[PDB]
């Protein structure tokens, strides 16, 4: 199955006790990703070096990725994080250098009519997965 | 809202089979606030006309709005607003257009310490009703 948070039928997706918006499943695997993977870390471990590195990443990724995904107009996801990142600049920390980057590619992923209920899942390990990827061009050997 | 939006149903969400972030409830609350107010729906029924009017209230709004709330950054949250509600032209929507705005102020909130499980109800009401507030603010008299 490959995705170890299926652990019940849509029985219980469908039991009328809960429903949150999908903009909150992509945020919270995210969030879980980061915890389960060292090679993201291993970024934020070197984040106290230039910013810029982290940033003109962040911008140079996204613009690849979001036209990779296929979404409206791609610049604006690679636009709100670098401009997020780089006057927030004070959250260097682990959990709050990605708190900025799921929660607006979330919101703007949203926009191609993508991110369903499951698929959410799909994309924030694809997001996550493509920025260690990415980092292991700019981070080396430790 | 005739006290329906305080029933302290806290109770039913921490019941061992759930727990979203306060980052997503404030989402949650906003279309729910967005659907009763009227005026603010029929800022999204115009869509079809000039998009600039949605794009520079935005900027306008959240200048202030996010100095009101008293952010570290508040140029950040309007300057990426700004450039996505000129980003989404294919998907003008009512929740689609809300969604930018509620989820970029939801991540700029939760990241600081500001926004937590109860208080984004009051925070996602001020923030709604401040956008109707400044949408008549710009229509003609008669």
Do not use: R, W
Not at 3 to 29: E, H, M
Not at 48 to 74: D, Q, T
Not at 97 to 114: H, P, R, T, W
């Amino acid at each position: 199955n490959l995705s170890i948070g299926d652990t019940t039928s849509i029985i219980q997706l469908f039991k009328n006790f809960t429903g949150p918006p999908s903009v909150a499943t992509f945020i919270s695997n995210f969030h879980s990703i980061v915890q389960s993977s060292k090679t993201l870390l291993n970024l934020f471990d070197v984040a106290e070096e230039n910013p810029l590195e982290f940033a003109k990443c962040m911008y140079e990724l996204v613009l690849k990725s979001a036209n990779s995904l296929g979404v409206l107009n791609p610049h604006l996801i690679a636009n709100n994080i670098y401009q997020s990142v780089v006057s927030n600049l004070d959250i260097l920390h682990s959990s709050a250098m990605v708190n900025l980057y799921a929660n607006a590619m979330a919101g703007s992923l949203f926009l191609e009519g993508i991110l369903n209920s499951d698929n959410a899942a799909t994309l924030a390990k694809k997001c996550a997965n493509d920025m260690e990827a990415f980092a292991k061009k700019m981070v080396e050997i430790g």
